[PDB]
Structures are given as C-alpha cells and as structure tokens.
C-alpha cells in the first residue's frame, strides 16, 4: 500500500496500490468508476 | 460508405477498473469493432489465456499506445498502421511497452505489429519485459519521425532464445513476429535520394505524395494509405480548399465551387447545425478574444466585439483548469459573473469534501448560488453531487439551452446521476440540441417522465435514459404530481410557475386560459402563446379582434386621431423636423393628421393661412 | 535594382501615333529600359534602318504580343521568357505576327526570340512573313499551352529563301535563326515520364518545381526562373500563406507566424492605405454588394450591411460598361443616386458630339447635374470636355475624396485638360489618396495655382503638373485673385462659398469676418472659430452675448417660461408623457410654470381646483 | 480609305486608314492622342 502521503488520492472508494516495477502509484477503481483516480461514473453502461 | 467505426479510447493511465475479469469487460466493450481510436489505446492487466481477438480491426490511433503491465501471450495488433501521437504518455513517448511479465519471469511473447509504418509525433519505449521476442532487431529509424531519435529510449532483454529465429528472407533480419509475412517493410530509408518521403519501393517513380503517412500505392494523392492532414472524402490534402479564391487580374475574390469547411481534421460541405462558423467557413468551437454570437438563419456566425462585450468563461479542463477536475473551492471565484460558460461543468463529490492532495479546501454549499447567472453552457453538464439539504438544483435556474459542442464520453451532454434531490430545478431548458440525457440514480425524484424531450431535442436521433428514478407508480399518490392545471408536457416542478409552455397561453409570468381577444379590459393579441396588450390608441373592438401587434400600426381603428401609418392620441404640435423647422399638424374630417402652413408658427387649426387666424 | 522596372504596355493594337518617326520615338520612350510589360507589347509599324536595340531587356509580358506591319531587320527580343497571355489578341491568340512586309517583300528577316519558353495562355499565329527564316522549325507543342492546340494558325512561305541553316547541335535542328546559341533550348519534351512539369535535364531526378513557369536552376521552389503564380521575393508560392491556421486538435483558428496578404500577385505584410483589406487577408479594390467600406483607422475593411445597404455604383470600364468608353447619352441615368463610384469616371467630347459608330445621341449638356450626389471616386477622374456655357464644374461640387484605385495611365488620378472654364469648381475636395494630378491646357482658368495640393495628397511621392493655365499676371493684374475674406491660401474662386479655410467666423460654409454676436435677428455664438445659430426664443441681449450654446438652457435670459433645464415658447399644457401620466402646467405673472393639481384633467391655472372647473 | 460606315469612328480629328492585308481598320492618330479610336490624350509627355 502507498505510504502516508497519497491519502485521499483515490476518489469514489478505491484502493491505492504501489506498482513495484515502474515505481508509480495507481488506483483500483471499483466497478462503475473510470478515470485516472476513479472520478466519473460510467454513463454508457450504468447509472 | 465512406466512414469508419470510431471509438473513444481510454484515459486511465495505469489504473485497474476492478479485478482482472471485470477489467477485461472494459477492454472489449469499447475496443470491439473499432476502426480508428479517437483517443488512446491502453492494454493493461490482461491475464494469461485471455482472448484478444477484437484488436484485429484497429487501423489508426489518434493518441499514444500503452501495452504495459500484462501477462497475456499474444496481442494481435496486425492492422495498426499509424500512431498520430497527439497526446504523449510520460510527455515524451507515443508508444510504451513496460513490465509485461509476472513474478516468475514470463509473460508477453508475440506482438504482430507488422503493419506499423509511421509514428507522426512522439517516441517509443521498451523496458523490462524479458519475454518479448524478435522485436529487438527491428530498425526503428524507418517508423519514427526524423527528429525523434534521441528521446525514443529502448532496450531489449531477449536472451532466452525460446522463440524461433527470424526468416532469412526479410530486409536484414527485421521481423516483428515469425514467418515471411511478419517482417518490417521499410518505406522511409530504402528508396531513391530524390523522394519526398514515403515510397513503395526504390524506383525513382515510386516516391509517394508528401501527404501519405504510412506508404502509398501510386504517386497520386488519392492513393495514400493513411494521410497526415485533412481528407476531402476522396483525397488527402494539406489545407481544405478555400471557399473563395483571389484573382490576380481584377483584385477580387471569386467563389470556389470546390468549397469545403475545415471541420476538425476533415473537410466537409457544411458545418454542423450547432457549431460557430468562422468568417472563412471553418467550423470552430467558439470564437475567442473579442467577439459575439449571431443566430442568423441557423448559421451561428460571430461578428465582432464593440463596446462592453462581457467576458466569456472557459469550462473545466481547458485553459487554466488543467490541474483541477471540477469546480473546487479554489476556482469558483473565477466564475464570479460568467454568463455563458464556453466549455463544460464538472460537479464532483470531491468538491464538498476537499482533498489533501490538491490542497483545495472544502466548498461551502451556498457558494453554488454564484452560478445563478450562468445563462449558457455550450458543452456538456455533468451533475454528480449536490448537497443533501437542498431540494433541487437551485443555481441553474433555466439554462434555456445546452448546445453540446463537446460531450461526456462522447455521447452525453446532460448527466444527472445519484442525486438525493427531490426536484429538477431546471425550468426552461428550451432547446437541448446535441447529445443524450442520462437522468437516473435519483431515488426520490418524481415528475420526470412527463417532459417530451422530442419537443426539445433539435438534432434527430437523440434519446433519453429515464430509468430507476422513483418509479412513476404512486408519485400521484404521494402528491408529488405536478400542478394539475398547466397543459401536461413539462412541469419540472410541482408549481404552475414552471410548466413546458403554459395551460393555453400566458400573461407574462403567469399562465391563463385564453388571451383578451374580442372582450376583456385590455385588448391583446397572440404570438408564441403570449398575451401582449394592444397600443392604447387601438379602438376596443366588440366584434372581431383589436390589433395584430404591439405598435399603433397594427390597429383596426384608432381611438382618437390618425397621423399616417401610426395611431396618435393628439396630432404632433412641436416635434423636431428637418432644417430645425418645427412641426404642426391638424385633424381634418376622418381625424387624419395633415401638416400646417410653413408660415403658421404657433400652429394651425386648419389648412394653410385660412386655418390659423389672427 | 532588386525590383523589376515595370512598364505599362500599349493597348492600341491598330493605330499610328503620328508619322513614322513619331511612332518610333513614342514606342522608344514607352519601352526604353523596362523589364516587365504589365500590358501588351505592340511593336507595329517600325521601318528600315531604325534601332530596336532597346527591346533587349523585355523579360515578361502580361498580355498578347503583337508584331505586325513593320518592314525591319532583326527585332532583338533575345530575352523574352514568358507571355502570361492575360488578354488575347482577336480573342484567341497571345503571340500574333501578321503581315510584316512592304509592297516589295523585304520584311521581318529574323526574330531571335530564343529565350521564350512558355505562353501560359492562348494560341499563336505566324501569318504572311515573306522573308522570315527559322521560325518555321520550332516546336509549337512545347511552348504553347497544351489546351489551345486547336487554334494554332501557322502559315508561311519563305519563297524568297536567303537564310542559311544553323549549327546542328540542338533537337531536330530547332533553331531560332542562326548560330549555335541562337537555337532552341526546350524544357518540356525531354523531361522524364514522372516529371510534374518542366525540367532542366533528362534524368528523372531533375524535374523542376510544380510552380516554375519556364525552367529552373535547381530542384527547389526558390530556384524557379519565372513564378507561375504569387511570388514572395522567394519561393514562388501558389497562394500566399494564410493569416490563421486551423490546428484541428483544438477546433479554433490559431494564427500563422508567416501570414501575408495577396496584393495581386505578391505576398506583402500589410495592404496599402487606399486598398480595402479583407478578413481573408487580401488587398482588394471593392467587395460584394452586401457590404460597404466601413473606415477602421486606415485598415478600412468592409463589413456586412445591415438592412438597407449603401448604394455603391460601378464606374465606366467595369461590368456592363465595357463597350462604352465615356458617359454616353444612354448610360447617364445609371448614376442617379450613386453616392459613391466603384471604378472611375470618363467625360470625353464624343458624348457631347454624338457617336454614329456607337449609335448614341448627344448628351444633354445640363444632364451632368445628376452626378452631384457623387461623393467618393475609387479610381480616377478624367475630364476632357465641358460645355462652353458653364464656367465651372457645376456637377462635382459635392465630390469629397478620390481614392485612386484604378488610376489612368498608371499615372495621374485627376486630369482636367483642354477645358474652357474660369473657376475650377471642386469646393469639397479634401484628399486625393494616391495618384497624380494634371490641370493644363486651359486658356481662361485660374485659382488653380493658389491651392496647396501638397495637403490633398494622401501618400508620399505624388506630384502635380500644372502648366499652360492662364498666366500669373493675367490673373493678378485683372482683379480675379483670391478673396480677401479667406485664408491666405487655399481658394477655389471668387464667390464666398468656396475658399477652403477661413481666418474668421463662418456660417457653416462661407468665410465671413463677423457674424451675429451683437446684432442681427438670428443670433449665433462662436465655438472653435465656427459660429453657429441659436434659439430665437432666448432674449436678444443688446449688451453681451445672447445665448451660450444651442439647447434651451443656453439662453442668457430666456424671454419665455423656463422649466428647469428647458425653456420653450409656451410651457407644456397637457403633453402626454412617460409612465402613462399627464404633464399639466399653467401661467402666472412671474412667468414660471409648475405642475397642476391632478384633480382636473383640463389643467389648473392656480392653487388646487378653484381655477379649473371640476 | 475607310468607307461610308466608319464616319466618326476616329475621334479627335483622326484620319481613317485601311489595312487591306489583315482586312482591318485602324486610325492614324494625330500627334498627342492615343487609344484605338484616338479617344485618349497622352498625359505622360504633354498636356
């Protein structure tokens, strides 16, 4: 898990994983939310 | 047929939209039957034994390409031709392939990107994927552009030898895969010195037009494979053929029958019915620094700024809004008096919450009364958060129209998702023109399944998505049905204050059963279902109508006197005229006003001197 | 001289300018030391022993090239390179040689036109040169445009053969008359199969640019010899680089850092002052009828005319006015309400005398007053006849400005020669932007040397030529000199109406010494040395000034009733007003008017209701 | 000479000459006047 520096980075209840290869951080958006940090709600498929 | 099947492409740099199984469904729901990716292409977190077979029809990508962090074995991009790298991944690369291996040193093996010919803008990056084979010997000087030879870093750790060696029937052992077909076909560094770029061979007549981007068939322009600039639906030009051409003999401009509007990387015979046509016939999003708009016979030209032309307000993302992703509590002040937001509006639940990432403090809910003067949104409206205590969208009173220049996900302009609100709060919305509406997720929201959007949608083909919004059953029972008098087509609210148009007609801000034609105290007329009072000088007609307009010019009979076309109360007696000469008139038989004698100074009660006595 | 010394070129094509020695001297000074003919190149009627060695510098022609009826030896046109053929001789040809002989057949021997390499338009013709050699073995399919090959009319019988055959060192012995360098040098029928246009060798690697019009030194656009279209002091472009590019990534016109204006055929940075700029970036002479030239501080383009549109009026020489050459007594009615003239105006004695060849009756000598409404001339004004009865230009007394777009002779923009008029009569000339002016050959005409034309000239470089007018002392010692009640300079005649500037007050137009400040019934007041009349309703102050401006509140002591900022002959007595109420005043001894008691509609005369009946 | 058809075809006191070779008609402009019908007046050298 990413350190105590990127808290609140992942909107809409997504976890913050640390990519060990590229040395980067990235979200894991729950179903429905797309975007770099899970902001939007997939409108074409759900509501 | 002359158009392809386009798709919008991802934008999630390196996220993971769920688990490995429900991520793949996001890949195949959007990249299925693609022909040209309008955005980007990103293949990430595709696990072993997963079937990638819809990647066969992808022929062109308008952004970058990211093939990183997956452990599939074969990705068949066997039709990718050109990467017109508008956007850059890592701000330097237009095609990146990194870390395609799981823990036990295995992963991606093949990559049949044999047809990949040119990468207009950007670079290529290969690092740390010790399972990809045969793509190490590919000479890259042929595909990338000229200058982009110091920023296309690359390294290949292919030492396993577990792949069949290259076929010795290819140009210097440059093969993308295995077989005679999968071999790099150079078309940039093999042909004659006097070639202008792409060249399907070596003969001095093989050189291609400098407007083909990935090789050609013949030396013409209409034979390009993919082109670097506009497309006049048969050829591939550099700039669209202008509407009017000069004339070096008469110093004039001559109409060009081959007139094409430069509509965003393709020439068209006519701008869309919702775009602002530039002076020299080029569809643009919105003319900027100092101008207006002009709805003349549909063609929304924009003439010029003169005097106090108010400032126009740019939507989220564009301009100085690249960092923030919504109207957070550090930029809502810049919307102090924006009255036409040329762009898009994002209301994200991060606004009212406040994040320690971008250091933006929480937004005060009453700050949203600033938007009470936003008369126009040209792009799209994504409504995704709204304070609980509020009963409806209070800020956006009428909006009057949303045009839809840009859209959300390329399909939607209006978006009302997951709102605890009770009412709409949008009481005119008269001419929504482009895009669909997603009004769903609001658990307590009645009087939505009565607005006839076909009366509002300008473009033909748009549809509604009114589902699962406090189902119409029992909305009448709980009293939430709108006002029972106004003609039912509208009623965004439960009051008669806001209904589609009106019961029958209207007296300003109120609806009525019928205008005051024939009878009534004030005489009126009807236009657009509105009741306007006749000029006080029209005679009360107890028989037929009274007037056909506001001015005294449309009266059927004047109450007092009649000075020519107009109906006057008393004929002029001191009105300024030409040469500083005053004006005096008199009423004759039919109460008609005729002028005095040039002599009569204090006026006259009759024609000539025989009318103004001593 | 970086810029090519241009000449105008004749347009006679079948005429004799005096005697033979006169025709040749006029042709001499006309074409002496000029390197581009912007017109035509008539070389007719030269005779033996003359010298045409001054034709050794003609390099281009912009129209047909006639060579006819001149019995002479070689015409050393050894440097012509292109005949753009913008206008055809006999509607067909662009190089027409006809009947170069006498009644003894010792005509045009040779014509070393070797350097000619392309005729951009029109056919050719070479009839009837009995002694003409080696202009029969040249390729009229290499030079002539590949379209008009059906109009060629070569026919020649050198049955007096006396010319040798020249050095066999060039294609098919295609020799332009003698020698070895005097023979053809072709660049179209030796190019490779895949060459765009002309070339310089035979290899497929030496085709010329697509914009060169006659050969090229190198393979680059900056190496053409004669630009086929717009030039840039550089690479011969095809259309001047536009001002704004499109940038289809973000749909908005981004400007170009190299945009230039198309001034006929050139790419200049800025349009000249007297030329209408356009939004497209093209200096023009006029624009569509759905517009008018709105001045914009010397950048005066023309925007769309809303509703009614200004009456632009096409001058003589343009449009339907083609077969006409002056103001016939059939096209005078077409200048009725033309406040401006797009084009130019011709007045010649043929109009007053009547042309049987044109079948137009003589002009009514008084019909010229129709032209009074004319206010602006775009081209030039040429007058060569005015009736002897009138003594001044009684029809152009309202003319304001002469632009100078299409100027006569490539020269003088105002020409008044061979007249009998004492006073000139142009009281309203204020500026002649570009051109020149000659007023000469007028026996009884004066006051033309007093005006300071240096001020009326817009640009710098213009100059006047005023000679042969009535002498200085024939005017000085006869009384007909500049008026004393006028400026020390700038006068157009005796009468007070017209003498430009004034040294004292002026009743709008007329320079006078003292206006009505202390006496006189209509009094005035001076502002910036232009005294203007004021209300009679004020009181005549026999001591000091009797008004302080124009409005009603500018009476020193208004003799009538004063209502605040307004004093009128009689204060309002029941005038309908704003907010749907009536203004009712009354009269008293102190001569002040106040609002009446609203009780009686008929208007009060005092306090309350006791005056007016109720 | 020119026949009874081009009377007044040559303005400004100009004699009408006949070119029998080309079967074309042409003026002999008196010195000073230019143009096909001698209509203009040469300003660049005289008045």
Numbering used by the authors:
A (entry chain D), D (entry chain C): 5 to 51
B (entry chain B), C (entry chain A): 1 to 614
Paper text:
To test this hypothesis, we examined an oncogenic variant of EGFR seen frequently in cancer patients, in which a leucine residue in the activation loop of the intracellular kinase domain is substituted by arginine (L834R; this is residue 858 when the signal sequence is included). The activation loop is a key allosteric control element at the active site of the kinase domain, and the L834R mutation promotes the formation of the catalytically active asymmetric dimer of the kinase domains, leading to hyper-activation of EGFR. We carried out cryo-EM analysis of full-length EGFR(L834R) bound to EGF, using the same procedures as for wild-type EGFR. The two structures representing the tips-juxtaposed and the tips-separated conformations of the EGFR(L834R):EGF complex were determined at resolution of 3.3 Å and 3.4 Å, respectively. When the angle between the heads is at its minimal value (~10o), the flexible leg swings maximally toward the ligand-binding head, increasing the distance between the membrane-proximal tips of the extracellular module by nearly 15 Å (the ‘separated’ conformation). Although the oncogenic L834R mutation involves a residue that is located in the intracellular kinase domain, this mutation markedly stabilizes the flexible leg in the tips-separated conformation of the extracellular module on the other side of the membrane, compared to wild-type EGFR. The cryo-EM density for the flexible leg is much better resolved in the EGFR(L834R):EGF complex than for wild-type EGFR, with secondary structural features clearly visible. Thus, activation of the intracellular kinase domains by oncogenic mutation preferentially stabilizes the flexible leg in the tips-separated conformation of the extracellular module, providing direct evidence for conformational coupling between the extracellular and intracellular modules of EGFR. Our cryo-EM analysis of the oncogenic EGFR variant (L834R) show that the stabilization of the flexible Domain IV leg in the separated conformation is correlated with the presence of an oncogenic mutation that results in increased levels of kinase activity.
